[PDB]
Amino acid sequence: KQAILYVGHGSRVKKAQQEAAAFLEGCKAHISVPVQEISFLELQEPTIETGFEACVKQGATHIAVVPLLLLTAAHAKHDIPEEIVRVASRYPSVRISYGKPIGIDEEVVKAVYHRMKDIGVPYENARVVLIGRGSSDPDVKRDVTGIANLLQEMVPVKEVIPCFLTACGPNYKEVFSELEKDDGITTFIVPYLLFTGMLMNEIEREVQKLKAHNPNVYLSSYIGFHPHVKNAFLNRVRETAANSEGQFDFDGGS
């Protein structure tokens, strides 16, 4: 009767496809919902159309669409809802709820914490550089800053400086240029990203480049599908499925 339609962003790099698919499959066993399908916005199938239609043939009357996204931007606001409306127009009897990206959640702050500790370097009063992809949509910068504020307050770090790969400032290269110094403060670099690929690889080169000036800089792995990221995402899934007040009812918002 009830369905979950998971939507990942999709990748063309084989490794990212496998990581995202494996994560969503391991999500299925935590949700007591009889119909559950995975799908991806782009570059990777099953498509949103395919997964939605799969939900319908297994008899779903209600579909809770939950996006696997760290942050809220054009993908969350437009692309996914547009695909949802396109496929859902063909099934007006199917009720739809639409969840939020993980966004500002204490669990993701815990994921950043475990990535920092994994480096094995003392963390007290240390600087953290939180690199998000970035977007021209201000909600992205706002949410990464909110995540930075929660981490800053919860762990006795010096500060957490959000910066971005593209589209909005400060660019991580500006911070890096300001980090050529070497002041004895240990620098953790945490990529606030779900997948590896070229941008993760360029940051890797940049962390070596930065380390050439200031040896007290250490790049952690990107957060990825950390268990605490998984906890936060399952919260998103459960709240979309519960829909206890109808607040996630999907008004066709392309």
Question: Annotated binding site, which residues?
Answer: 9, 75
Token digits of residue 97: 């709820």
Report the half-sphere exposure of 184 (CA within 13 A, side-chain side): 0
**Nearest Cα to Cα of residue 129 among 191, 196, 210, 222:** 191
Name the one range near Co ion by CB under 5 A: 25-33, 49-57, 122-130, 170-178. Answer: 25-33
Task: For Co ion, give the closer residue by CB, 75 or 95.
Answer: 75
**Nearest Cα to Cα of residue 17 among 8, 26, 5:** 8
CB atoms within 10 A of CB 47: 17
Separation CA 182–CA 174 (nearest Å): 16
Q: Does 215 bind Co ion (CB under 5 A)?
A: no
Task: For Co ion, give the closer residue by CB, 110 or 236.
Answer: 110
Least spacing, CB of residue 61 vs Co ion, in Å: 27
Residue in 1, 26, 156, 252 binding Co ion, rule: CB under 5 A: 26
Task: For Co ion, give the closer residue by CB, 116 or 130.
Answer: 116
The binding site for Fe cation comprises 9, 75
Residues paired with 127 in a beta bridge = 159, 187
Residues 86-125 that bind Co ion (CB under 5 A): 110
- Secondary structure class of 155 (helix, strand, coil): coil
Separation CA 5–CA 243 (nearest Å): 14
Q: Does 82 bind Co ion (CB under 5 A)?
A: yes
Least spacing, CB of residue 228 vs Co ion, in Å: 6
Q: Does 253 bind Co ion (CB under 5 A)?
A: no
Task: For Co ion, give the closer residue by CB, 116 or 203.
Answer: 116
Residues 168-187 that bind Co ion (CB under 5 A): none
Instruction: List interacting residues with Co ion (CB under 5 A).
Output: 26, 82, 110
